[PDB]
Subunit: 84 residues, 2 copies
C-alpha cells in the first residue's frame, strides 16, 4: 500500500461489481476481513457507501456521491500517470 | 488522501523534479512538513531514497530500487483506472 490505500481497492471493487459483502470484498482484494470492515465504516460515515440487507446477509454498494468521488479520484490518478 | 497516500505524491514529485528538499516537497505537494519528514524517513529506511547535501541544504532523490518501486506502483494505479 505504498501509493494506494486499502480504501482505493475497496471502492474500485464496488465500482465494477456493484454490490458486495464484506467477505467478498476481502477475498477479491486480498485485504484482511477486519481491515475491510473498518474501512467500510468510514465509507458509510462519509456517505460514499450504503448497506443493503438481502435476507440474512449484508451487502454494500456505492451511493451517487460515492460513484462521483470514485470517478473523480480515478481521473486524477489517470492524470498522475500522464504527468509521470 | 482517499485513494492515494501522501507518500505517493512525495514520490511523484521526486520523479518530476529529480531532487528536492523536505521544505520544497512540502510546499509543492501541500503536505505538512512533519508528514513529509515521517514519509521521507520510511523511504530512507527502505532504501528507496537517499539524501544529497550541498553544504547546509539537504536534498532527496530516488535511488535505483526507488525508481523500480515507482514503476511497479505506477503499474498498479494504471491498472485501477482501467
Amino acid at each position: 500500500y505504498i501509493f494506494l490505500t486499502p480504501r482505493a481497492y475497496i471502492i474500485v471493487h464496488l465500482l465494477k461489481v456493484g454490490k458486495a459483502k464484506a467477505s467478498e470484498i476481502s477475498e477479491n482484494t486480498q485485504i484482511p476481513y477486519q481491515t475491510v470492515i473498518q474501512n467500510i465504516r468510514w465509507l458509510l460515515a462519509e456517505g460514499y457507501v450504503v448497506k443493503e440487507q438481502k435476507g440474512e446477509e449484508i451487502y454494500y454498494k456505492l451511493t451517487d456521491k460515492g460513484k462521483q468521488m470514485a470517478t473523480a479520484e480515478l481521473e486524477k490518478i489517470r492524470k498522475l500517470v500522464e504527468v509521470v
